[PDB]
């Protein structure tokens, strides 16, 4: 043992890279002109959007996903659009999970469920978004809104 | 779905990926919808298609309708009016820059114009028992200079015994990016690839293997495959997945794959959309001379021969080695040497058999002319075999055998003045061998050696080395055995010794605050099987906070051999500071008692001024952060910024990304940064500025109110006094770094309005962050 | 008149004429150097002393032969010395006894060098001697030639001085030590000697002889010689003084010397010659 | 020439003096994010072994590295961090696994020579877990 | 693709600042990073100041978020204090719906010189089996993050038991018998599986 090279390193646990996908509506006054379908008029060609959790860390095994945003005055489970003059009326965006069920908007941390992830290999969460009518009829206008995706780690 | 044909202002997509939006004309052709788009060459090249991949596209006009569906095999297009988009499916074999880790040429930083100086003054004093004393002092001096893209260097040293300047090296290197090579002017050296290493002083244009991405350097099986439809290709090796990427329909080519010969064979699978699989395995074995398919390494040199001996001449010469990679694991090579009294030609040819192991065999003919004007012709052929890590753990790294004729002489042999170095006892046959064997989990057996024969004498050069390493948990059991027998001497010099390394790291808590976790004991006993036997116990480690100072204490005993015994003792200190290094060692061997001493360091002379630090190493990153003081650099041991706020990074890799990060915990309480982490991409021998804007002064959080209401979100705020600035968040709060004790504040959010002013109390100096409240003007 | 010898002898061919293989012992004598003393080698007897008497003389033209064919000297015939090569006839010697008596002849050489020497290997020609035999009975006379041959490798002196050995090989230690060179020079007469070195040199000072080694020589290493404590350069005459009968060692010592830059490991060898010159 | 003397000599190479007997390399902090993929490697860190005061007659120095290795071929990690190994190279682009040797020239002016090397962390199987990295490489010099 | 340096941050009592890496791997997507600190009730009570609280990241950038203390020793120092770090990322520029990304992690304010070591807290977890429910008791001054709570073969819900307190979970009677559990350490890894000790 004439000389010795000693190596000392430390691997830090990393979180996850979250890439969001901006959803763009098209519809073009199809349902809006016809329905007119009570307050449960949640019939709109769902636009599939995904939240990319990639790449992630090896510790990230389970997380608590949940949405927060500005609710509608009529239906609390609907994300209200921008209250502008050029905007529409009597509409509220509904958010659905991969199993096509209504996700509780503005829900606390004690209501959300643990979405188990894959440690290492990239994860992907697929969600849907459609329009639900609160008032009737629906006037033609812009469809802009804002929301917030909270990723609560274990 | 479908709409009547015509011009379409539609966003163009390439394999479900947006690119650009132009007016696309659709004509009636052979497809699904019965219509085909009319695109041009200039658009497809700016879309993702590599026009060089399609032979016959350069003949078409500038705005001619390219028949992609016919001219290009396995290519389909589709227009969709339902979502206003245009889906295309081009094979990835027609795309460029597929290499993972690829770095664009324009990102490469040529560096900054600055002077260079690297000192390393060492030497030792020996106190003999019977004889007297002996002082020695050797000072290094690596001068240098960078001018944009030119790198000047000048090596020289000074010596003292018990006395003048001796010159070493002086060159001027430059990297030629368009040629992907390097131009060396002055003192240099060639590669020992084909012909033996030659020291010279002239011009050399050789390809740099450092420019290529690390996922493309070295030989590796370039996997070619053709998929019918959209498939997902995955590649496994030794049970674990190594490669994974989805590919469009049509032919494809994978020229990545990190070189790992001793990892086993590749397992490729192409799972189609339906479920059909194309299972085929490609074996892996690599010889150091092999070139990857497409890679071309060359080395044209020209100058005078410079050895440094007084018994040698300075003849003119030329050397142009060339290597190229061919499909199916084939590799051709062989350069040519032309000189005044010597010439030589080489022919390579080498293939990766894979299942039988890679092999390359080249032959070099030489027409030499010895100093006595006696011509001698001859050839020299070498063999190079390699096999991957077998199932039993058999790793045949290299089996080499070179055979030269009786009339074969190297170029260096024809550079001497007198005959009787010798030209009547040239080397005949050399046999190299290096094989490692993994013995289970915690054991590895190492084997190596050489065997040289000479024309005339029946004498043989013999070297041999075998070492078995066992790893018991934390303890590393090392046992080696060497054997060196020269021809021009008598007796076999073989040494037999074992080493036991026991680190204290895994003996305590992993979170222990004791400095004993940074230490390790090393006991070794030696015996040359000829009377002499030694034994040495020693403990070494590091100290201080950043672990710069390296200590070592070892004492032992030696005796036998020829009747010479005595106890030993050694102590070494090696410190690396932010202003330079220092190394002092002391040796005690009863009869012999010496004392080592040496201080090295690096000096940079940039535009801003001068910065001290550790000894430079070819590529050095200059940190520029005026304001910081004791700023620790992450991933860098011993690197601290000076009092000015500047620093130098001795450790920097070329043609890759280097993360220059400053540890913000070590920053002053009156200093903050806009960005503490930056990346640099230096060329070989470059000096890149790593700038970090610092803010000297008090950090404060202001609450700006306008008309009994706080300022809106996203309101820009700039200081009149200092250059520093910030952005207003919620509740009209704004964080500012490096602010004066009192000064005017400018605010502008729409089209400036608000004008603030404040005067913090001088007593609030010993606070890292004070909060206040102010108003505006209009 | 029949002759013989004990050591080697030769074979008679073409009648009474032949060569002769004899032992050599050349010693440096004052004035002239002795070559071969045939008075202790060849013995001749008369088979009929009481009926006839044989007379033998040495004619002119008797000179050396072979490599010594260019040298001169003297010849001791029956106690008296005569110029060699002989320019005239020499007195005759009576041979009338059955007892084998020696043939009193000793060839000498005239010194022309200081302490030079020529090597004579076993089987080479030495001298060409012309004899003449007569008798008292009748007037029958005939001439014949006796050539001289050596049967042992021996060096013959050329000057008034000689050495202990002419080919000595000394071995240096394992660097950078030194070893003494055993070379002594004796003289039969007080002379003013002066030897100088010659051979292949390296440096411009001509003090470092190149490493003329055979198998895998070293580099940047040469051989330098010294006496007492001073460097002895090439082509520079070193004086001894007045060398007497006692052997005087030159006092030389072989040392290692650095010629160029880098010092390649390997064996070292340098062949250095020396020539003597009278001062 | 009257007397020709042949002088035979012999120059052997003698051991130098090691100045760096315990050089230590700290990789710092790595993320599992960076070494998640298979073949991913950390940045290089230049390390050099300085050998000073080489006796006259020694122009070449050969160093023989040695250590423990795993199934990948590179040096095994004795730390808690799994699925991660260590690679050793020189300033030429050649891997120096547990055994391979390297020979360098000695500067005759300063009577010393060094070994320009480089060290990085890498993973073949991918997915480097959180843990410590402990690695000790043994090496013996052979002068010539 | 915004990513945090770690999944949790421990704040030693007495320290001035702690680092946190916010890395964006998207070369073109520009984000606006916002950050703050909530309490155990999820309300920004200004106990921890985040600097910088608002900044822009143009392309593939990186920055070091330093978190300052704003308590001046006015919190319970016998056990840990629960806080929540929130890093809000806003995509910077058609009837579109732009989403916001809040990366939410925990924030343990650990007092200086505590009694029981951190690693010796996961084995102190006690239980209370009764009816169709299970109570987890944590006497330690540490926030035990319990996960993978397997009651034999059945897998139960995750739970975070406060220090010197307790927390109940759902437990079906149609489950196993022997209780096993694993905890989340201070580094994000998993402590070895243990045995449930009720009462």
Curated annotation (Swiss-Prot), chain B:
Q: Which GO terms describe its biological process?
A: pilus assembly
List cellular component terms (GO).
cell outer membrane
State the InterPro entries in the record. Answer: Fimb_usher, Fimbrial_membr_usher_CS, FimD_plug_dom, PapC-like_C, PapC-like_C_sf, PapC_N, PapC_N_sf
- Entry's localization field: Cell outer membrane
Which Pfam families does the UniProt record give?
A: PapC_C (PF13953), PapC_N (PF13954), Usher (PF00577)
**Disulfide bond positions:** 754-776
Highest taxon in the source lineage = Bacteria
**Keyword check for Transport:** yes
Q: List UniProt keywords, sorted A-Z.
A: Cell outer membrane, Disulfide bond, Fimbrium biogenesis, Membrane, Signal, Transmembrane, Transmembrane beta strand, Transport
Q: Does the keyword Disulfide bond apply?
A: yes
MF-aspect GO terms? fimbrial usher porin activity
What is the protein's membrane topology class? Multi-pass membrane protein
Q: Which family does it belong to?
A: Belongs to the fimbrial export usher family.
Q: Which PANTHER family match?
A: FIMBRIAL USHER DOMAIN-CONTAINING PROTEIN YDET-RELATED (PTHR30451:SF21), OUTER MEMBRANE USHER PROTEIN (PTHR30451)
What's its job?
Answer: Involved in the export and assembly of FimA fimbrial subunits across the outer membrane.
The protein's name is Outer membrane usher protein FimD
Please spell out the taxonomic lineage of the organism that makes this protein: Bacteria, Pseudomonadati, Pseudomonadota, Gammaproteobacteria, Enterobacterales
Swiss-Prot record, chain C:
Q: Name one Pfam family in it.
A: FimH_man-bind
Respond yes or no to whether keyword Transcription regulation is given for this record.
no
Single Gene Ontology MF annotation? D-mannose binding
Query: What's the superkingdom here?
Result: Bacteria
GO BP annotations of the record are: cell adhesion; cell adhesion involved in single-species biofilm formation; cell-substrate adhesion; mechanosensory behavior
InterPro entries found in the cross-reference section? Adhesion_dom_fimbrial, Adhesion_dom_fimbrial_sf, Adhesion_dom_sf, Bact_Fimbrial_Adh_Pro, FimH_man-bd
Cysteine disulfide partners in this protein: none
Q: Keywords for this entry?
A: Fimbrium, Signal
Extract one GO cellular component term from the record: pilus
Location in the cell: Fimbrium
Q: What is its main location?
A: other
Annotated family: Belongs to the fimbrial protein family.
Q: What exactly does this protein do?
A: Involved in regulation of length and mediation of adhesion of type 1 fimbriae (but not necessary for the production of fimbriae). Adhesin responsible for the binding to D-mannose. It is laterally positioned at intervals in the structure of the type 1 fimbriae. In order to integrate FimH in the fimbriae FimF and FimG are needed.
Q: What is this protein called?
A: Type 1 fimbrin D-mannose specific adhesin
Taxonomic classification: Bacteria, Pseudomonadati, Pseudomonadota, Gammaproteobacteria, Enterobacterales
- As recorded in Swiss-Prot or TrEMBL, the protein's gene is named fimH
Swiss-Prot record, chain D:
Q: Which Gene3D superfamilies match?
A: Fimbrial-type adhesion domain (2.60.40.1090)
Taken from the UniProt record, the cysteine pairs bridged by disulfide bonds within this chain are 16-54
> Which InterPro entries does the protein's record reference?
Adhesion_dom_fimbrial_sf, Adhesion_dom_sf, Bact_Fimbrial_Adh_Pro
Q: Where is this site: Required for stability and transport?
A: 143
User: Per the record, what is one GO cellular component?
Assistant: pilus
State where the protein is found. Fimbrium
The record's keywords, sorted A to Z, are: Disulfide bond, Fimbrium, Signal
Does Disulfide bond appear among the keywords?
Answer: yes
One GO biological process term is:
mechanosensory behavior
Assigned protein family: Belongs to the fimbrial protein family.
PANTHER family from the UniProt entry: FIMBRIAL SUBUNIT ELFA-RELATED, PROTEIN FIMG
The protein's job, in short, is: Involved in regulation of length and mediation of adhesion of type 1 fimbriae (but not necessary for the production of fimbriae). Involved in the integration of FimH in the fimbriae.
**Protein name according to UniProt:** Protein FimG
Q: Which organism is it from?
A: Escherichia coli (strain K12)
Curated annotation (Swiss-Prot), chain E:
Query: What top-level branch of life does the organism fall under?
Result: Bacteria
The consequence of residue 168 to A is:
In strain: Clinical isolate 149 and O2:K1:H+ / MT78
UniProt cross-references to Pfam families, sorted A to Z: PapD_C (PF02753), PapD_N (PF00345)
The answer, when asked if Signal is one of the entry's keywords, is: yes
- Keywords, alphabetical: Chaperone, Fimbrium biogenesis, Immunoglobulin domain, Periplasm, Signal
InterPro entries cross-referenced by the UniProt entry:
Ig-like_fold, PapD-like_sf, Periplasmic_pilus_chap, Pili_assmbl_chap_C_dom_sf, Pili_assmbl_chaperone_bac, Pili_assmbl_chaperone_C, Pili_assmbl_chaperone_CS, Pili_assmbl_chaperone_N
Location of this chain's protein in the cell: Periplasm
Which GO terms of the cellular component aspect does the record hold? Answer: outer membrane-bounded periplasmic space
Q: Which GO terms describe its biological process?
A: cell wall organization; chaperone-mediated protein folding
Q: Does the keyword Transmembrane apply?
A: no
Q: Any idea which GO molecular function terms this record carries?
A: protein folding chaperone
State what changing residue 18 to V does: In strain: Clinical isolate 149 and O2:K1:H+ / MT78
Record function comment: Required for the biogenesis of type 1 fimbriae. Binds and interact with FimH.
Q: What protein family is recorded?
A: Belongs to the periplasmic pilus chaperone family.
UniProt protein name: Chaperone protein FimC
Give the organism the record lists: Escherichia coli (strain K12)
């Amino acid at each position: 043992a004439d000389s010795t090279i000693t190596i000392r390193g430390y691997v830090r646990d990393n979180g996850c890279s979250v890439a969001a996908e901006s959803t763009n509506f098209t519809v073009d006054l199809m349902e809006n002109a016809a329905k007119q379908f009570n307050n449960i008029g949640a019939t709109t060609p769902v636009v599939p959007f995904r939240i990319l959790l990639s790449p992630c860390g090896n510790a990230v095994s389970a997380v608590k996903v949940g949405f927060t945003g500005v609710a509608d005055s009529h239906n609390a489970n609907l994300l209200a659009l921008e209250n502008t003059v050029s905007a529409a009326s009597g509409l509220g965006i509904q958010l659905l999970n991969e199993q096509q069920n209504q996700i509780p908007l503005n829900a606390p941390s004690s209501a959300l469920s643990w979405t188990t992830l894959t440690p290492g290999k990239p994860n992907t969460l697929n969600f849907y978004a459609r329009l639900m009518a609160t008032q009737v009829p629906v006037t033609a206008g812009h469809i802009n809104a804002t929301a917030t995706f909270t990723l609560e780690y274990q | 779905q479908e709409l009547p044909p015509g011009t379409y202002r539609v966003d163009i997509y390439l394999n479900n990926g947006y690119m650009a939006t132009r007016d696309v004309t659709f004509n009636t052709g052979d497809s699904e919808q019965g219509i085909v788009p009319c695109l041009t060459r200039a658009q497809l090249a700016s879309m993702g298609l590599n026009t060089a991949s399609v032979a016959g596209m350069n003949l078409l006009a500038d705005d001619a309708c390219v028949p992609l569906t016919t001219m290009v095999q396995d290519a389909t297009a589709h227009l969709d009016v339902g979502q206003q988009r245009l889906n295309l499916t081009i094979p990835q074999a027609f795309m460029s820059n597929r290499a993972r880790g690829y770095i664009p040429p324009e990102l490469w930083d040529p560096g900054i114009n600055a002077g260079l100086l690297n000192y390393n003054f060492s030497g030792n004093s020996v106190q003999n028992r019977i004889g007297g004393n002996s002082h020695y002092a050797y000072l290094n001096l690596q001068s240098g200079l960078n001018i944009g893209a030119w790198r000047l260097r000048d090596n020289t040293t000074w010596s003292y015994n018990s006395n003048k300047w001796q010159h070493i090296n002086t060159w001027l290197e430059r990297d030629i990016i368009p040629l992907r090579s390097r131009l060396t002017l002055g003192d240099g050296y060639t590669q020992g690839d084909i012909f033996d290493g030659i020291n010279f002083r002239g011009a050399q244009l050789a390809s740099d293997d450092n420019m290529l991405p690390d996922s493309q350097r070295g030989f590796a099986p370039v996997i070619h495959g053709i998929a019918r439809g959209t498939a997902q290709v995955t590649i496994k090796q030794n049970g674990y997945d190594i490669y994974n990427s989805t590919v469009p329909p049509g032919p494809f080519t994978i020229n990545d794959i990190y070189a790992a010969g001793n990892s086993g064979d590749l397992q490729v699978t192409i799972k189609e959309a339906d479920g059909s699989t194309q299972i085929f395995t490609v074996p892996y074995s690599s010889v150091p001379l092999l070139q990857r398919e497409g890679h071309t390494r060359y080395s044209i040199t020209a100058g005078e021969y410079r050895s440094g001996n007084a018994q040698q001449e300075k003849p003119r010469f030329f050397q142009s080695t060339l290597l190229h990679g061919l499909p199916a694991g084939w590799t051709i090579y062989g350069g040519t040497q032309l000189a005044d009294r010597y010439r030589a030609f080489n022919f390579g040819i080498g293939k990766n058999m894979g299942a039988l192991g890679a092999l390359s065999v080249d032959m070099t003919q030489a027409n030499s002319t010895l100093p006595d004007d006696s011509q001698h012709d001859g050839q020299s052929v070498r063999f190079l075999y390699n096999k991957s890590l077998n199932e039993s753990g058999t790793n045949i790294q290299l089996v080499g055998y070179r055979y030269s004729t009786s009339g074969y002489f190297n170029f260096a042999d024809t550079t001497y003045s007198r005959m009787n170095y010798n030209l009547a006892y040239n080397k005949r046959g050399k046999l190299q061998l290096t094989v490692t064997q993994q013995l289970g989990r915690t054991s590895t057996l190492y084997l190596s050696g050489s065997h040289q024969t000479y024309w005339g004498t029946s004498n043989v050069d013999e070297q041999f080395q075998a070492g078995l390493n066992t790893a018991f948990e934390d303890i590393n059991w090392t046992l080696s055995y060497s054997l060196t027998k020269n021809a021009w001497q008598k007796g076999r010099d073989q040494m037999l010794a074992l080493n036991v390394n026991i680190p204290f790291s895994h003996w305590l808590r992993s979170d222990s605050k004791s400095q004993w976790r940074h230490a390790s004991a090393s006991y070794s006993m030696s015996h040359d099987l000829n009377g002499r036997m030694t034994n040495l116990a020693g403990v070494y480690g590091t100290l201080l906070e950043d672990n710069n100072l390296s200590y070592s204490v070892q004492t032992g005993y030696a005796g036998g051999g020829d009747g010479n015994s005595g106890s030993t003792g050694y102590a070494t200190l090696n410190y690396r500071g932010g202003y330079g290094n220092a190394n002092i060692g002391y040796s005690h061997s009863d009869d012999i008692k010496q004392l080592y001493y040496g201080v090295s360091g690096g000096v940079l002379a940039h535009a801003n001024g001068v910065t001290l630090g550790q000894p430079l190493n070819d590529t050095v990153v200059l940190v520029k952060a005026p304001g910081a003081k004791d700023a620790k650099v992450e991933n860098q041991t011993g690197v601290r910024t000076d009092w000015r706020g500047y620093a130098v990074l001795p450790y920097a890799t070329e043609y890759r990304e280097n993360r220059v990060a400053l540890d913000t915990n070590t920053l002053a309480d009156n200093v903050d940064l806009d960005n503490a982490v930056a990346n640099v991409v230096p060329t070989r021998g470059a000096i890149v500025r790593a700038e970090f804007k610092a803010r000297v002064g008090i950090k404060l959080l202001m609450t700006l109110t306008h008309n009994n209401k706080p300022l809106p979100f996203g309101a820009m705020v700039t200081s009149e006094s200092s250059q520093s600035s910030g952005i207003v968040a919620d509740n009209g709060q704004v964080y500012l770094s490096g602010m004066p004790l009192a000064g005017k504040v400018q605010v502008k959010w729409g089209e400036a309005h608000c004008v603030a002013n404040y005067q913090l109390p001088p007593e609030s100096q010993q606070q890292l962050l004070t909060q206040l409240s102010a108003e505006c003007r209009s | 008149f029949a002759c013989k010898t004990a050591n080697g002898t030769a074979i008679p061919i073409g009648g009474g004429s032949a060569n002769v293989y004899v032992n050599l012992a050349p010693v440096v004598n004052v004035g002239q150097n002795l070559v071969v003393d045939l008075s202790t080698q060849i013995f001749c007897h008369n088979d009929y002393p009481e009926t006839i008497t044989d007379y033998v003389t040495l004619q002119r033209g008797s000179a050396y032969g072979g490599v010594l064919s260019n040298f001169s000297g003297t010849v001791k015939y029956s106690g008296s010395s005569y110029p060699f090569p002989t320019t005239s006839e020499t007195p005759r010697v009576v041979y009338n006894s059955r007892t084998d008596k020696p043939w009193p002849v000793a060839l000498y050489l005239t010194p022309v060098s200081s302490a030079g020497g020529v090597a004579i290997k076993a089987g080479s020609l030495i001298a060409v001697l012309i004899l003449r035999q007569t008798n008292n009975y009748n007037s029958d006379d005939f001439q014949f030639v006796w050539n001289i041959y050596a049967n042992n490798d021996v060096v013959v002196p050329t000057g008034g001085c000689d050495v202990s050995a002419r080919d000595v090989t000394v071995t240096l230690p394992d660097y950078p030590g030194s070893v003494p060179i055993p070379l002594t020079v004796y003289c039969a007469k007080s002379q003013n000697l002066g030897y100088y070195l010659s051979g292949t040199t390296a440096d411009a000072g001509n003090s470092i002889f190149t490493n003329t080694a055979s198998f895998s020589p070293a580099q940047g290493v040469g051989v330098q010689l010294t006496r007492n404590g001073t460097i002895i350069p090439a082509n520079n005459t070193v004086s001894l003084g007045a060398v007497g009968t006692s052997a005087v060692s030159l006092g030389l010592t072989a040392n290692y010397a650095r010629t160029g830059g880098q010092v390649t490991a390997g064996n070292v060898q340098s062949i250095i010659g020396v020539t003597f010159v009278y001062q | 020439a009257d007397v020709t003397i042949t002088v035979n000599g012999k120059v052997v190479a003698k051991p130098c003096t090691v100045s760096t007997t315990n050089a230590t390399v700290d990789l710092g902090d790595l993320y599992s994010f960076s070494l998640m993929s298979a073949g991913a490697a950390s940045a290089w860190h230049d390390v050099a072994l300085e050998l000073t005061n080489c006796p006259v007659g020694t122009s070449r120095v050969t160093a023989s590295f040695s250590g423990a290795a795993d199934s990948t071929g590179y040096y095994k990690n004795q730390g808690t961090a799994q699925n991660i190994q260590l690679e050793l190279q020189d300033d030429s682009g050649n891997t120096l696994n547990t055994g391979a040797t390297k020979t360098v020239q000695v500067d005759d002016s300063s009577q010393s020579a060094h070994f320009p090397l480089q060290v990085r962390a890498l993973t073949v199987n991918g997915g480097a877990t959180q843990g410590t990295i402990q690695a000790v490489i043994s090496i013996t010099y052979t002068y010539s | 693709g915004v990513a945090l340096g770690a999944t949790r941050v421990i704040y030693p009592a007495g320290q001035k600042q702690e680092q946190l890496a916010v890395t964006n791997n998207d070369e073109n997507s520009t984000y606006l990073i916002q950050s703050w600190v909530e309490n155990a009730d999820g309300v920004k009570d200004g106990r921890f100041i985040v600097t910088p609280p608002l900044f822009a990241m143009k392309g593939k950038k990186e920055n070091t978020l330093r978190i300052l203390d704003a308590t001046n020793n006015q919190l319970p120092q016998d056990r840990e204090s629960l806080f929540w770090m929130n890093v809000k990322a806003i995509p910077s520029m058609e009837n579109t719906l732009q989403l916001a990304i809040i990366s939410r992690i925990k924030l343990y304010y650990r007092p200086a010189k505590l009694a029981l070591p951190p690693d010796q807290a996961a084995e102190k977890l006690r239980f209370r089996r009764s009816a169709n429910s299970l109570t987890l008791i944590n006497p330690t001054p540490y926030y035990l993050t319990v996960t993978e709570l397997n009651a034999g073969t059945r897998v139960l819900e995750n739970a975070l038991v406060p220090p010197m307190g307790e927390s109940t979970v759902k437990l079906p009677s149609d489950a196993g018998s022997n209780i096993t559990y694993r905890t989340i350490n201070d580094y994000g890894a998993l402590t070895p599986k243990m045995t449930g000790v009720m009462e």
